[PDB]
Amino acid sequence: RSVQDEQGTFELEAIPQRIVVLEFSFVDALAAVDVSPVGVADDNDATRVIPAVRDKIEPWQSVGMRSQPSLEAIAVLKPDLIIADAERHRAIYQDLQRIAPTLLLKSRGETYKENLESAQKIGVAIGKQAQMTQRIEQHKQTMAEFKQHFATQETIQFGVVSDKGMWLHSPVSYAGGVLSTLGIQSPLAPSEQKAYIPTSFELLLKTNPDWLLVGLYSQPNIVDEWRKNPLFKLLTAAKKQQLVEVSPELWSLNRGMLAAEEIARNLEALL
Ligand SMILES: [Fe+3]
């Protein structure tokens, strides 16, 4: 078995039994083929993984924050496969390799397609190419079926908000790619190149999505401070009251197949 990860070639002979994953998308790929990771970087909060995944798999031991995992906690779990993020864990990758063979894959800031590609590479590295390939095809057809239930040209835009500000998830974000797969139009330019866009109130006005779905990280947030602005009423999502609060765990953090399906289900209930 061999894959190309974000550093080149990853090879494995034995079937890994104890897997430690450092992101939530990887928890999806393992759960899709009934593999329970023994360790997850869950930022010390298992509820950040959506319940549809944790129902498929055994409970895990937390190895700490996704941005800064505990190498000790990982090593104590005695894993034989570590699945890390290409963006978040470039610096600690070589330290992760000291513990066990480490696969460097993308999730944060990468497309819905690239997250599907990483699930395929995970299926190879664990020895379930055929089962993972079949699970991915059943997902692609499920979304193609949801693409028929939707018949609207309204623009939908997701973003996370906090006291710090608002970040619009562009078409090349995971949530943006999920919407494109469902045939939903995006209000942002087709050539937007960053997934999480720092969004000023003026930028929000220039975009003016018909639907603004927002995952709240802090109550209250910068959006409430923008409602103080009387210019806020010019927003289509404000006019039609189509500014809806959604789960940031589902739409931003989890970035998996089973979350894309719940997104298509949740998007259906809105329309
Ligand atoms: Fe984050």
What is the DSSP annotation of 226-259? HHTSGGGGG-HHHHTT-EEEE-HIIIII--SHHH
Distances in Å between the alpha carbon of 230 and those of 55, 133, 201, 225, 233?
45, 51, 12, 11, 6
Domain identity same for 136 and 195: no
In a domain, 228, yes or no: yes
Q: What spacing in Å lies between the alpha carbon of 89 and ligand 1's midpoint? A: 14
* Overall size of the chain counted in residues: 271
Compute the distance between CA of residue 210 and CA of residue 205 in angstroms, rounded to an integer: 11
Compute the distance between CA of residue 130 and CA of residue 143 in angstroms, rounded to an integer: 20
Q: What spacing in Å lies between the alpha carbon of 23 and ligand 1's midpoint? A: 11
Domain identity same for 191 and 253: yes
Range of the domain at 111: 2-144
Q: What spacing in Å lies between the alpha carbon of 210 and ligand 1's midpoint? A: 26
CA 207 vs. chain centroid, Å, equals 23
* Contact between 21 and 37 (Cβ < 8 Å): yes
Compute the distance between CA of residue 181 and CA of residue 169 in angstroms, rounded to an integer: 15
Long-range contacts from 244-248, C-beta under 8 angstroms, 24+ separation: 244/211, 244/212, 244/213, 244/214, 244/270, 245/213, 245/214, 245/215, 245/216, 246/158, 246/213, 246/214, 246/215, 247/50, 247/215, 248/160, 248/215, 248/216, 248/217
Total number of domains constituting the chain: 2
Compute the distance between CA of residue 142 and CA of residue 189 in angstroms, rounded to an integer: 27
Phi then psi dihedrals of residue 221, to 5 deg: -150, 180
Q: What is the amino acid identity at position 127? A: G
* Contact between 252 and 166 (Cβ < 8 Å): no
In a domain, 34, yes or no: yes
In a domain, 96, yes or no: yes
Q: What spacing in Å lies between the alpha carbon of 17 and ligand 1's midpoint? A: 29
Compute the distance between CA of residue 107 and CA of residue 261 in angstroms, rounded to an integer: 17
Structure tokens at 166: 């608002």
In a domain, 138, yes or no: yes
Compute the distance between CA of residue 163 and CA of residue 225 in angstroms, rounded to an integer: 9
* Contact between 83 and 31 (Cβ < 8 Å): no
Domain termination residue (choose one: 107, 124, 144): 144
Name every residue whose Cβ is closer than 8 Å to that of residue 189 and which is 6 or more positions away in sequence: none
Q: What is the resolution of the experimental data for this entry, in Å?
A: 2.5
Among residues 23, 27, 34, the alpha carbon closest in space to that of 128 is found at 34
Q: Compute how many other C-beta atoms are within 10 angstroms of the C-beta atom of residue 63.
A: 27
Which residue bears the tokens 């995970």?
122
Q: What spacing in Å lies between the alpha carbon of 160 and ligand 1's midpoint? A: 10
* Contact between 186 and 99 (Cβ < 8 Å): no
Domain termination residue (choose one: 115, 144, 173): 144
Which residue bears the tokens 């664990």?
126
Compute the distance between CA of residue 51 and CA of residue 207 in angstroms, rounded to an integer: 33
Q: What spacing in Å lies between the alpha carbon of 67 and ligand 1's midpoint? A: 8
Domain termination residue (choose one: 116, 144, 172): 144
Q: What is the amino acid identity at position 102? A: T
In a domain, 24, yes or no: yes
Domain identity same for 128 and 196: no
Helix, strand and coil content of the chain, in percent to the nearest 5, comes to 40, 20, 40
Among residues 182, 115, 114, 191, the alpha carbon closest in space to that of 154 is found at 182
- Cα angle 117, 121, 125; round to 5: 170
CATH label of the domain that carries residue 223: 3.40.50.1980
Domain identity same for 137 and 247: no
Compute the distance between CA of residue 200 and CA of residue 138 in angstroms, rounded to an integer: 39
* Contact between 64 and 73 (Cβ < 8 Å): yes
Domain identity same for 167 and 193: yes
* Contact between 177 and 256 (Cβ < 8 Å): no
Among residues 245, 257, 239, the alpha carbon closest in space to that of 213 is found at 245
Structure tokens at 221: 């947030």
Q: What DSSP state is assigned to residue 217?
A: S
* Contact between 214 and 246 (Cβ < 8 Å): yes
